[PDB]
Subunit: 356 residues, 3 copies
């Protein structure tokens, strides 16, 4: 990719992409998981991503993590989540392909895979160092508390408490698989969480559509419950791009659902990168960096991106230039008045490859 | 204390308690003081604690600290505070045994012991590195400003300025002791602070109480002036405990008013601790860590705990398990359907001895 | 300057002043510039300052910086700014001598000097590590993106792109200089920013006036656009001082507009400093530190000062001593009742010279 400056792409810059599709899965009993955060992807400071899969009847046990909020995109299949708030309120809900969930910092939750196939989902966390091996597990908790005290807390005999796990369980296919949603009632009288904490992203109408190119956006404006995180789906036709832009107020974490994605990134100071991502690869654009993404393949492209802010903010190059008077633009770009008037006058979000 | 996993208590973790009652006092003319923060209790990042006493007519001098808010519980005796806000408003007030005060970051204040006893109190600060040696003292200030400038600001002669203290006074019993409260009038016309910055804690009705065990809570709901911080009193009968829980949004700092406390802290990744606290000893429980406290002794237990958030938030293991369906629970704990049904169905905050 | 404690001024403290007047200017085509941040003035953590000048028709090119907000005071002459918000809204306005602007983090902007002489202004940033060499330049941007993508984004030929600059332009005088304000119209339909992002500071009625001494203040109350930054103008007569005070909620950055300033700073634990600043020199007071400033010269003094909070808070030694009862003051200062009653009973903010 030639550039007007001949910058050596990548030089003096952290990687902005990670070959996540090549990270080995860690295997569990009815589940798989891998993760990418600052520990292996140094640039990714504000967010970490976790791939996880659950089979039918496999649960990611009751756990919490106060150091991070959990935003989720279900890529395939069907899950059921439970979520319990600091106010004793609960949500028990199904989330399917294209659905989101948001677990506020430190709230207890679980995720179970419901049949017939395997649920596969992404979990993005608003803390770059987050690791699925440093969550707080209830099985770990109760097995690391004096037995007498657990007996007292539960009102149980030693023989009863003795049947609890002896260490963190993490993922379980011990059973039973959960029944129909309507029957999944709390064992004790419990007030329902009323602000929705799941949401349907994929089935939204596009916010923007231009010759096949599509953007669906879920910010606090459409998913108020995810109050400080936003996510979007972009669909890119062959040859098309998301125009050049930057986000004033957020980092952008990316994952390629299918296709091949070219991403370019401008730090300041004459430094910049460009590079390709395969299906299942990950990208990260730090707050304020200029960037753009192009589909250079023969096939369509789908990615999900996530921002660590509930208020989606974008300034496109075109919008920016369009807002300035000729004189300013001509002076900045040092170009003839004839060329000046040919700068962008409106902002179409995507840009098309040239027409037949 | 046996566990299911036979975990070695304390292995791979910092101390969650500090033998404060063994920390020596520093002595002043009319008061005494000691402190615990990250400098001697490394885990205590979110809060630091100071113990202080004031003889009658001794005063903690006018000072300020922009780097920390000051939240207080009066353990014994009676005090009088003054407090001056950025809008030139003042509160002059009494705080007795069981009373709170909150001094917003950088607002000026003073504390005096009124009669007829020794006032003893705890100051808790939302900054673990806070040090009583690092306050901005007005006596220190004027003695460290150029004489000429002090003359000008006060409109005083060299001989008048000459009589000010030569270095930080800190605590003084020079006098006079203070008059009745209705006579403690500002020397100049000064508007009064209207949102209360003191509060009565010990005197509240128990928020929750079961079989003699009681919890008194002062969050921003009951003490809005303390917008930033929350305080609580727990009284625990022999053999009883606060249930297993964690706090999603805050660190917990603890002091033992009287009795003996057993504290357990579980830190994740198979690590956990359990230990005893004598009276006057201090505990700290990092945000989000699971914990519980228990009275394992023949006498009663009384402690004050403080959170660095004004919105008290708790998830009790019981509420949590109660909120979940049979299947999820059974599958998680890998126990039988019959045992599953015997998991908590309600949360009584405390658990009684069986 | 003698003191009651005989403190060795400066000892165990960082410099609270910086000889900015003697920092070499970096020369551009019709513009000059120099800067002070933590890189050369270690104490200045919360705010960095930039001096800049533009000739008629010299523009500081279209750029942005998400890492910091921009508060400006115009010292001499006249400028025009443009500011584009995350919602494709624009303000295009003139800012003349004594006027402010505020550019929110990561909003895109530009500054042109308009006639007739040299525009001279201060830029204060709410990040003490900000450096004018690390902004995001639109020209740098476009010369560091794949050419084919610049083509597609702009709907332009390779021939047309070859005309754009080849590296960061920074300051341009290529022209044309901008025309009358009413003709400075955006090149494409752009809604206007409705909340004013400029403000007349020097033109304000003084907030406080005592025997020639005057403070003019622009917090969020008079300039709500500058939501988290405050600026003030202090005029100080020969012999006069700003009373001893501290700010509970903000650091203070100071620049000497003309005259000769004296700053004392008190830093806790028997440590304090005092020193002189010449015109063009810079002062910094960390939050909470006790301070006062005095004019010890035979002529007048003018400073601008900036705060990294939109809510102005000051507690004066006088307001404070005034609000306590005699017993408290007497006991604290260890002095006779007689003397106690002669402490301040009101607050005039300045103090007139008391030397006979
Ligand atoms: Mn989780
Ligand atoms: Mn983007
Ligand atoms: Mn204090
Ligand atoms: Mn607790
Ligand atoms: Mn700028
Ligand atoms: Mn000041």
């Amino acid at each position: 990719w030639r550039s007007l400056s001949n910058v050596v792409w990548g030089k003096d810059l952290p990687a902005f992409t990670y070959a996540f599709s090549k990270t080995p899965l860690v295997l569990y009993d009815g589940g798989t998981t891998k993760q990418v955060g600052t520990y292996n992807f140094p640039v990714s400071k504000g967010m970490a991503g976790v791939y996880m899969s659950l089979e039918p009847g496999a649960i990611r046990e009751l756990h919490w993590h106060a150091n991070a909020a959990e935003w989720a995109y279900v890529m395939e299949g069907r899950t059921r989540i439970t979520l319990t708030s600091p106010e004793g309120k609960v949500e028990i809900a199904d989330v399917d392909k294209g659905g989101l969930w948001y677990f506020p910092r430190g709230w207890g939750h679980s995720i179970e895979g419901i049949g017939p196939d395997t649920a596969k989902f992404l979990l993005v966390f608003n803390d770059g160092t987050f690791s699925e091996g440093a969550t707080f597990s209830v099985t770990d908790w109760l097995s690391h508390t004096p037995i007498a005290w657990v007996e007292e807390n539960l009102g149980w005999t030693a023989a009863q408490v003795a049947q609890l796990p002896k260490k963190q369980v993490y993922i379980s296919s011990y059973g039973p698989a959960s029944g129909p949603l309507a029957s999944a009632t709390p064992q004790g009288q419990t007030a329902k969480i009323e602000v929705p904490h799941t949401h349907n992203l994929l089935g939204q109408q596009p916010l923007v559509s231009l010759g096949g190119n599509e953007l669906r956006l879920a910010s606090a404006k459409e998913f108020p419950g995810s109050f400080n995180m936003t996510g979007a789906l972009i669909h890119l036709e062959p040859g098309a791009m998301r125009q050049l832009h930057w986000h004033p107020n957020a980092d952008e974490w990316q994952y390629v659902l299918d296709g091949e994605m070219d991403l370019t990134v401008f730090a300041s100071e004459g430094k910049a990168s460009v590079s390709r991502l395969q299906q299942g690869d990950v990208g990260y654009v730090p707050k304020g960096y200029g960037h753009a993404i192009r589909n250079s393949s023969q096939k369509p492209l789908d990615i999900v991106v996530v921002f660590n802010d509930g208020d989606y903010q974008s300034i496109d190059l075109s919008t920016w230039l369009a807002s300035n008077p000729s004189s300013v633009l001509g002076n900045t770009f040092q170009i003839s008045p004839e060329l000046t008037k040919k700068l962008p006058v409106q902002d179409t979000i995507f840009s098309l490859p040239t027409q037949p």
